[PDB]
Design a protein around this motif. Structure first.
Motif, PDB file in Angstrom:
ATOM      1  N   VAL A  34      37.048   8.053  57.487  1.00 50.21           N
ATOM      2  CA  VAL A  34      37.670   9.365  57.483  1.00 50.21           C
ATOM      3  C   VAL A  34      37.394  10.107  58.788  1.00 50.21           C
ATOM      4  CG1 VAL A  34      37.684  11.614  56.401  1.00 50.21           C
ATOM      5  CG2 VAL A  34      37.400   9.562  55.003  1.00 50.21           C
ATOM      6  N   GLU A  35      36.138  10.079  59.226  1.00 52.65           N
ATOM      7  CA  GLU A  35      35.738  10.767  60.449  1.00 52.65           C
ATOM      8  C   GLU A  35      36.594  10.319  61.621  1.00 52.65           C
ATOM      9  OE1 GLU A  35      32.208  10.581  63.686  1.00 52.65           O
ATOM     10  OE2 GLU A  35      31.554  10.450  61.595  1.00 52.65           O
ATOM     11  N   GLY A  36      36.914   9.032  61.652  1.00 48.47           N
ATOM     12  CA  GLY A  36      37.751   8.479  62.699  1.00 48.47           C
ATOM     13  C   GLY A  36      39.184   8.962  62.616  1.00 48.47           C
ATOM     14  N   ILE A  37      39.671   9.131  61.393  1.00 47.62           N
ATOM     15  CA  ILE A  37      40.999   9.691  61.164  1.00 47.62           C
ATOM     16  C   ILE A  37      41.046  11.139  61.645  1.00 47.62           C
ATOM     17  CG2 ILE A  37      42.615  10.463  59.387  1.00 47.62           C
ATOM     18  CD1 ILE A  37      41.769   7.978  57.790  1.00 47.62           C
TER      19      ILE A  37
ATOM     20  N   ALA B  33      33.979  13.533  55.119  1.00 46.41           N
ATOM     21  CA  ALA B  33      35.402  13.805  55.083  1.00 46.41           C
ATOM     22  C   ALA B  33      35.648  15.283  55.303  1.00 46.41           C
ATOM     23  CB  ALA B  33      35.995  13.367  53.767  1.00 46.41           C
ATOM     24  N   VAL B  34      34.706  16.105  54.858  1.00 52.16           N
ATOM     25  CA  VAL B  34      34.826  17.544  55.019  1.00 52.16           C
ATOM     26  C   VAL B  34      34.575  17.963  56.466  1.00 52.16           C
ATOM     27  CG1 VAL B  34      33.859  19.757  54.396  1.00 52.16           C
ATOM     28  CG2 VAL B  34      34.020  17.940  52.685  1.00 52.16           C
ATOM     29  N   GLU B  35      33.516  17.418  57.060  1.00 54.97           N
ATOM     30  CA  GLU B  35      33.156  17.741  58.436  1.00 54.97           C
ATOM     31  C   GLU B  35      34.331  17.497  59.371  1.00 54.97           C
ATOM     32  OE1 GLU B  35      30.600  15.817  62.024  1.00 54.97           O
ATOM     33  OE2 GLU B  35      29.650  15.741  60.047  1.00 54.97           O
ATOM     34  N   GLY B  36      35.066  16.419  59.119  1.00 50.81           N
ATOM     35  CA  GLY B  36      36.236  16.090  59.912  1.00 50.81           C
ATOM     36  C   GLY B  36      37.369  17.084  59.742  1.00 50.81           C
TER      37      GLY B  36
END
Ligand SMILES: CCCCCCCCCCCCCCCCCC(=O)OC[C@H](CO[C@@H]1O[C@H](CO[C@H]2O[C@H](CO)[C@H](O)[C@H](O)[C@H]2O)[C@H](O)[C@H](O)[C@H]1O)OC(=O)CCCCCCCCCCCCCCCCC
Ligand code: NA
Ligand code: NA
Ligand code: NA
Ligand code: NA
Ligand code: NA
Ligand code: NA
Ligand code: NA
Ligand code: NA
Ligand code: NA
Ligand code: NA
Ligand code: NA
Ligand code: NA
Ligand code: NA
Ligand code: NA
Ligand SMILES: [Y+3]
Ligand SMILES: [Y+3]
Ligand SMILES: [Y+3]
Ligand SMILES: [Y+3]
Ligand SMILES: [Y+3]
Ligand SMILES: [Y+3]
Ligand SMILES: [Y+3]
Ligand SMILES: [Y+3]
Ligand SMILES: [Y+3]
Ligand SMILES: [Y+3]
Lengths: 79, 79, 79, 79, 79, 79, 79, 79, 77, 79, 79, 79, 79, 79
Positions: A34-37, B33-36
């Motif tokens: 997700v972070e990469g997305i 997922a939130v941090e992103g």
């Protein structure tokens, strides 16, 4: 008698333990996916495809513990 | 007799252990997922879609331990 | 007799173990959800929505251990 | 007899184990919620609101272990 | 007889285990709350207010293990 | 007889386990409280005040295990 | 008889377990207190004062396990 | 008879467990005390003084487990 | 009889457990002491002196488990 | 009889456990000693001298568990 | 009889446990030894020499558990 | 009789334990494989090929525990 | 009789435990060896040579647990 | 009789434990091998060659636990 009581616990621990590692594994993989997305939204449709192949791969690990648990409960040869 | 007492504990540990890993797994994945999303709000509707596929995937891991626990308590073949 | 004593402990460990992982999981996710809000306050109403879907998802993990614990204590079929 | 001794320990471990994970979970979340407030004081009243929804969510995890512990000690159906 | 010996240990482990997680939890939260105060002294009176709500929240986690321990030692229904 | 031997061990583990978490907790908090003082000496008198409220809070966690240990050894109702 | 053998082990584990956490806790705190002194030597006399209040606080945690261990060995009421 | 065999093991575990935490604790503290000396050699004579007060503090933690171990082996009141 | 078998295991676990923590402790301390020497070679003779006082301090932790192990095996009690 | 079987296991665990910590300890120390050599090759002959004093120091920790293991196996006074 | 069965397990755990720590230890040391070589290839012949002295040192740790395991299996004095 | 009950548990733990490590292993590998794809989308078709060879390699680790579990349940030579 | 059953389990745990540490050890070392090759491809033929000496060194750690396992199963002197 | 039940569990734990470490080990190594490929795609064909030698090396670790498990189940000398 004993076997009925034994196979019944082995059915509990088989699915109990199986979820430990992959439960953690899918977590880091998905979250890092997700972070990469978030970093590169344009790569999304390209990214999930790997995360998908990955998640399924680890999901199969707990399936083996689920199947043996059921083969212990229902399809048990020893009782 | 014994089987009734045995399958009853295997029902406790099946759902007891199953939640350990994924409980941790969903945590890192969701939080990351939130941090992103915080970093890239514009990617939100795009981000959750992966986190959703991810969260469900890990949620199924504790379901197997829940199902076997119930198949031990209610639908038990050995008692 | 024995079953009454057995199902009673399985009720204790079911809810005892269930809270371990998600207790940790919700922690990292929420805390990391807050840090992002601090970084981007304007994204708040957008952020919690994911943290909410996330927290509920993990909260269901300890529910299964709570339900089985009660089905062991109250609705017990084996006693 | 035995059940009275069994349900009494399950009451101890239910509340004993329940506090492990969330005890850690609330810790990281709160501490990380504070660091963000220190970074952005202007976001304080906005920040706690999420930390509050978060802390309560995890506080419910040890409640289930507290309730079952009491249902074991006081309103115990099996004794 | 046995119950008196059983409830007495469950009183020991209830308060023994309860302090594990929150003992760690309050640690990170408080320490991280201090570092932020060092970084932004002007935010102090604003910072502790969250750390206070936070510390109390986790302090309640070991209270449940303390209360059940006492309800086991003193107010024990089963002896 | 047995109860005298049982309550005596529960007195050992109550204070034995209680110190585990907070022993670690106070460690990180204090050490992190010092590092901040080193960074900002001018904030010292302001810093300790939080570390003090914090240290006492965690010190109470091992007190509950100390009190129950003594209530087991000295003020024991069951012997 | 048994109680003499039981209280004697509870005396071993009380002081055995008590040192685990604080042993680690004082370690990080002291070491992190030193690093800060290295960074800011001028803050030394100001720094130790907090580390001292801190070290004593955690040293009391193993004292409770030491005292109960002795109250088990020497001042034992149950033998 | 039994007590002689019981106090003899409690003497083994008392000193066995006591060294776990502080063994780790002194490690981080000392190593981190050295790194700071390497960074600021001029602060050496000033640095060790804190590390010394620190090392002794943690060394006392394993002393309590050593003393009780000996009070179990040699000065044992119960045999 | 039993005591002879009991004190003999307590002698095994006393020295078995004692080495766990300090074994890890001396490791981080020494390794971190070396990295600093690499960073500042000129501080070497000054650095080891602390690492030495440190290593001995932790070495005493496993000594207590060694001594009690022997007091269990030989001087039993 | 029993003692022969007891001292024989204590010989296994003495050397079994002794290698756990130092096995890890020497690892970090050596590896960190080499990284520094890579960074400053000119300091090599100066670096190893400390790593050598260090490695021997930790090697002595597993020696005590080796010696007691042999004193249990060969020089055993109790059989 | 019993001793033959006892020394046989102590032979299994002696070599079973011995490999835990050093197995991890050599790992970090070697890996960190290679990263440095990658950073400074010119230091290679100089680097391995320390890694070699290091690897052998830790390899001796599992040797003691191997030797005692064999002295239990083959050269056993107690059977 | 006993063998039927013994092989039935060994079938549970074989698949229960096997999934622990690789479950974690595939997690870090996949997640780290995704992050790299996010960083360099153009390398995707090149990246998965390694992750695929990698995932299969670790998937075989839980297969051995699955196969032995089945060889225990179904084609069991000992019953 | 018993010895045949005892040596048979010691054969299982010897090879079961031996793989734990080095399994992790080779992992970090190899992975860290690869990252360096990625950073400096020109150093490849120079890099593996150390990783090879390293991997073999750790591979020998699980060999000792494999050999003793076989010496327990096949070449067993005690049956 | 007993040996048949004993060798059958040792067959379960031998492959059960063997996969723990290498399962984790291959994970970090592979994942770290891919990140490097993402960083330097041109080094791919050069990179895998090391990861391959590495993966096989760790794969052999679980093979020993697989082989002994089978030698316990099928080729068992003791039954
Ligand atoms: C390019 C890459 C190429 C790679 C491909 C090459 C693969 C070759 C592998 C060869 C190894 C197999 C050895 C055969 C042994 C066997 O057969 O042995 C046969 C046994 C039979 O069992 C029998 O079952 C019997 C049952 O007994 C019972 O019944 C009796 C009554 O009379 C008594 O009551 C008695 O008490 C009771 O025990 C007896 O016990 C017999 O002794 C016993 O032998 O089972 C069987 O059939 C075993 C079934 C084998 C499974 C197949 C394996 C995988 C196949 C390859 C997949 C594709 C390849 C592509 C890869 C790319
Ligand atoms: Na990252
Ligand atoms: Na991040
Ligand atoms: Na972050
Ligand atoms: Na941060
Ligand atoms: Na920070
Ligand atoms: Na910091
Ligand atoms: Na620092
Ligand atoms: Na540092
Ligand atoms: Na460093
Ligand atoms: Na470093
Ligand atoms: Na590094
Ligand atoms: Na990275
Ligand atoms: Na690195
Ligand atoms: Na990296
Ligand atoms: Y972009
Ligand atoms: Y903004
Ligand atoms: Y601002
Ligand atoms: Y200054
Ligand atoms: Y200076
Ligand atoms: Y310089
Ligand atoms: Y230079
Ligand atoms: Y003989
Ligand atoms: Y690119
Ligand atoms: Y024979």
């Amino acid at each position: 008698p004993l076997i009925a009581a034994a196979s019944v616990i082995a059915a509990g621990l088989a699915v109990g333990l199986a979820s430990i590692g992959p439960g953690v594994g899918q977590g880091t993989a998905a979250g890092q996916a997700v972070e990469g997305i978030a970093r590169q939204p344009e790569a999304e449709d390209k990214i999930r495809g790997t995360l998908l192949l990955s998640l399924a791969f680890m999901e199969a690990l707990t399936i083996y513990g689920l199947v043996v648990a059921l083969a212990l409960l229902f399809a048990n040869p020893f009782v």
